[PDB]
Amino acid sequence: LHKEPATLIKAIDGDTVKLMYKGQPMTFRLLLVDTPEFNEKYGPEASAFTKKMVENAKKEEVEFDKGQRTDKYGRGLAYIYADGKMVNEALVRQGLAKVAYVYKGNNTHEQLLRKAEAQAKKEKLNIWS
Numbered sequence: 310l311h312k313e314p315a316t317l318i319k320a321i322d323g324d325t326v327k328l329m330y331k332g333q334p335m336t337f338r339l340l341l342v343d344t345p346e347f348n349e350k351y352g353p354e355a356s357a358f359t360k361k362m363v364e365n366a367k368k369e370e371v372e373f374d375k376g377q378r379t380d381k382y383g384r385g386l387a388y389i390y391a392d393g394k395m396v397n398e399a400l401v402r403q404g405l406a407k408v409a410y411v412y413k414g415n416n417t418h419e420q421l422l423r424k425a426e427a428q429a430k431k432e433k434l435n436i437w438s
């Protein structure tokens with residue numbers, strides 16, 4: 310997989326973000342994770358975490374997997390990096406998302422993410438508290 314440029318337009322919630330990619334505005338849905346909705350427990354905290362991470366970044370990048378690049382809603386499906394650190398993995402590492410929506414052929418970072426989830430769970434962090 311390959312990292313590609315993008316620029317933040319706006320944080321949305323824990324696992325969605327509006328980015329400009331190839332010069333067009335797009336809503337991106339993070340691959341392989343599920344954050345609680347803003348209206349659920351840890352929902353606000355997940356939103357805040359993603360927001361800080363992408364807003365503070367000097368450099369945003371998107372990384373597509375091998376399979377589908379847009380979902381049925383027209384959202385881009387990618388791994389998102391802020392200054393080289395993967396937002397998807399960081400959410401899971403902090404117990405602010407569960408590994409989820411693991412579809413065949415769009416699952417390159419599955420094992421990295423499950424390892425992060427095990428650690429967050431061992432630490433009883435956030436959703437695992």
Ligand SMILES: Cc1cn([C@H]2C[C@H](OP(=O)(O)O)[C@@H](COP(=O)(O)O)O2)c(=O)[nH]c1=O
Pocket residue numbers: 338339340341342343380381386410412415
């Ligand atoms: C993360 C992801 C979600 N989706 C779809 C499945 C779910 O459909 P439904 O809307 O029918 O539940 C929805 C979950 O996204 P959200 O967690 O943003 O709601 O997005 C994909 O199709 N591919 C993906 O890789």
Ligand SMILES: [Ca+2]
Pocket residue numbers: 324343344345346
């Ligand atoms: Ca969600």
